[PDB]
């Protein structure tokens, strides 16, 4: 029958995992006790996005909206446009599509319209410089996220184009048992519908914290001005620590609210980047879920990924339990032989997933 | 707490700022001869890692991850097995057990490249039952043979080409593309005869849930009043409403003279006015090329030989020729469609 789940927790992942495995699922008791029960508008919008890239999929939403039945179809893709509700940014919808795009019949060319940033969801630069590089390591050679128009909250008005030209049979087996060496720090400090001085003030604040480092700091200033600046003022900064030895990246990002000091935000994000680097062994806590899933759907071989103790949190545990419920795959953790650090090696056997939607 | 919040939890800004005033905690971070031998090194290297990692884990941990490795003697228990299997059990006939990948579970349209076997006497017909053997499974389906028409559309063919491949679409369990298969029309011994039984051979090219086969539908009309380029055509349509839908459509004669549907005539219903690049004759026939969708029949009849008592007399849906003979029906035939010798008188003009 249906593999059952409880609550809205990990809605996107469960829908994504079912699509990759092809196993029908049931998600019930979604916000049963709330004054407004059931799915939110952005969750129904996300389901519509899933159908636009798949064929043959059956999605049934209960009369009260508290239960969802999903019988996945084959991933197809193609060209489409998706209007993101203001409740969530484009990144909330672009993020799950990264799990499905490389394994599609036709190339993913999706135009996302709506707010392009938020405090809780992935930013444009997080996807471009933080997640897409991870995909490139797994064998997704050609993937791009083109920014046409930036839209800051609350009125949004942005436009971004996801293009994943690479279609692959399955991700390459990962083998990283070392702690990457950071060679330099880069980033993008952006602003929309405000003066250029704000962007230069954020970079100053981040440079204050990062100047003590022994590596180069080069933060770009992407000031958006004119018709392509959206409908609301906004600014933000994203800092990416790069390891050119093997092309690995650690990033932190945040946006500015009304009444906030641009200098303070630059200090915070640069200060959060160092915290992220402290907690990381091979990938960031924010890049970890994407890597683990790709290793699960790899070839039937033992891939190895090094992780820190700080990365093993509630989110890491719930992710693994959901994977086992769908894929029956167990992540095996072993200590590293070093005493300088307390890292562990996460070893996962791939299920032998293959892109069967693509014509040969 | 939850993965929907992409950003991870962070401590308060001032606490991190004090923590990262000093960065010393994180300052630590900052030949094979032939290309064939290079690849063979890579597979062997990956196989070695599997064995090393497996050797590390405990036997129970090994069995939990890798599963039962090949060479293992195992007992597998099944439930809800048909009683005919236990009763009509013959040890001579083998029992083959095959694991299924996730694609194999799904049912849908299979698009394949297929040809009639060179030693098979007769060509195959569309919507004519064929027993296929995809993967571990054998079943009877109704395939539709199609052609690309110079890579423009999926047009329905009537029969397989005599001596080459053609695209075939049939409904059944999905399989990974590039999976070969073979087809047979008959499996019962009673009907074997003396001919070769392997009817078709093919390779699966694509899997999908729908297909858009289409068939050429020509609308035929005749002229009844001609004026140089302009002509009035009849019998193409039944009412002036139908003509209005097709105004501006391309039409041509058997001679190849191209034209257009200009306007519908008020009297009589169904007649219309057309303009041709050159004057047409009364003996000409005007044809409008149009395309009509065709649907794959969803017929699935797995070959359950073992369940039967005989195990060699399994019979499913019969061929169209056999059905006609059983009901004593003549093969449908159209006198117009028959070909005849054509003798041409010498062409002279005034």
């Amino acid at each position: 029958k249906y593999t059952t789940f409880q609550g809205s927790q990990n809605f996107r992942l469960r829908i994504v995992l079912a699509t990759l495995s092809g196993k029908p699922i049931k998600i019930e008791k979604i916000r049963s006790g709330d004054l407004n029960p059931g799915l939110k508008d952005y969750e129904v919008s996300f389901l519509r996005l899933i159908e636009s890239v798949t064929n043959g999929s059956v999605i049934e939403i209960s009369y009260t909206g508290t239960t969802v039945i999903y019988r996945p179809g084959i991933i197809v893709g193609g060209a489409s446009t998706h209007i993101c509700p203001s409740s969530k940014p484009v990144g909330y919808f672009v993020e799950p599509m990264l799990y499905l795009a490389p394994f599609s019949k036709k190339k993913f060319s999706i135009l996302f319209k709506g707010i392009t940033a938020s405090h809780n969801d992935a930013g444009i630069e997080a996807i471009k410089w933080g997640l897409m590089p991870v995909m490139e390591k797994f064998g997704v050679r050609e993937c791009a996220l083109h920014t046409l128009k930036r839209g800051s909250p609350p009125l949004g008005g942005g436009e971004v184009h996801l293009v994943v030209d690479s279609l692959i049979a399955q991700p390459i087996t990962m083998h990283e048992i070392d702690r990457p060496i950071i060679s330099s720090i880069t980033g993008v400090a952006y602003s929309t519908r405000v003066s250029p001085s704000l962007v230069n003030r954020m970079i100053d604040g981040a440079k204050k914290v990062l100047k003590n480092l022994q590596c180069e700091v080069n933060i770009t200033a992407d000031v958006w001005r004119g018709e392509n600046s959206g409908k609301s003022p906004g600014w933000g900064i994203t800092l990416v620590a790069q390891s050119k030895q093997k092309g690995w990246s650690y990033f932190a990002e945040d946006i500015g609210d009304a009444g906030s000091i641009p200098e303070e935000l630059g200090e915070k994000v640069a200060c959060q980047l160092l915290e992220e680097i402290s907690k990381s062994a091979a990938v960031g806590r924010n890049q970890l879920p994407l890597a683990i899933v790709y290793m699960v759907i790899g070839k039937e071989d033992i891939g190895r990924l090094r992780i820190n103790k700080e990365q093993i949190d509630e989110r890491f545990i719930i992710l693994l339990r959901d994977i086992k419920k769908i894929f029956n795959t167990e992540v095996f953790l072993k200590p590293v032989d070093e005493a300088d650090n307390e890292d562990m090696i996460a070893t996962i056997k791939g299920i032998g997933f293959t892109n069967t939607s693509k014509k040969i | 707490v939850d993965l929907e919040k992409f950003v991870p939890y962070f401590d308060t800004f001032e606490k991190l700022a004090k923590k990262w005033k000093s960065v010393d905690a994180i300052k630590e971070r900052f030949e094979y001869d032939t290309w064939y031998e290079l690849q063979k090194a890579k597979i062997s290297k990956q196989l070695e890692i599997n064995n090393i990692e497996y050797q590390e884990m405990t036997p129970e941990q090994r069995q939990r991850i890798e599963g039962f490795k090949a060479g293992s003697y195992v007992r597998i228990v099944f439930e809800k097995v048909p009683m005919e299997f236990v009763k009509n059990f013959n040890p001579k006939f083998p029992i083959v057990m095959g694991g299924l990948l996730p694609t194999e579970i799904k049912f849908g349209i299979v698009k394949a490249r297929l040809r009639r076997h060179r030693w098979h006497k007769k060509i195959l017909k569309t919507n004519d039952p064929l027993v296929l053997s995809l993967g571990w499974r054998r079943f009877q389906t109704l395939p539709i043979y199609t052609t690309t028409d110079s890579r423009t559309r999926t047009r329905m063919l009537k029969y397989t080409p005599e001596h080459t491949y053609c695209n075939a679409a049939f409904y059944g369990p999905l399989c990974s593309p590039n999976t070969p298969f073979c087809g047979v029309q008959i499996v019962a011994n009673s009907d074997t005869g003396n001919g070769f039984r392997i009817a078709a051979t093919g390779i699966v090219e694509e899997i999908d849930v729908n297909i858009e086969i289409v068939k050429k539908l020509k609308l035929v009309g005749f002229p009844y009043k001609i004026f140089k380029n302009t002509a009035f055509i009849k019998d193409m349509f039944s009412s002036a409403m139908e003509v209005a839908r097709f105004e501006g459509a391309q039409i041509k004669t058997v001679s190849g003279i191209r034209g257009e549907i200009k306007r519908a005539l008020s009297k009589p219903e169904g007649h219309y006015r057309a303009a041709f690049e050159d004057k047409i004759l009364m003996s000409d026939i005007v044809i409008l090329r149009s395309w009509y969708p065709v649907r794959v029949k969803k017929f699935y009849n797995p070959v359950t030989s073992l369940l039967l008592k005989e195990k060699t007399e399994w019979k499913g849906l019969r061929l169209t020729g056999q059905i006609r003979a059983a009901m004593n029906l003549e093969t449908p035939s159209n006198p117009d469609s028959a070909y005849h010798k054509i003798e041409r008188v010498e062409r002279h003009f005034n």
Partner: peptide
């Protein structure tokens, strides 16, 4: 043109 080549569909009974 959206309906031409689709077989599934979200069945919202709310």
């Amino acid at each position: 043109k959206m309906m031409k080549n689709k077989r599934g569909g979200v069945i919202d009974k709310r």
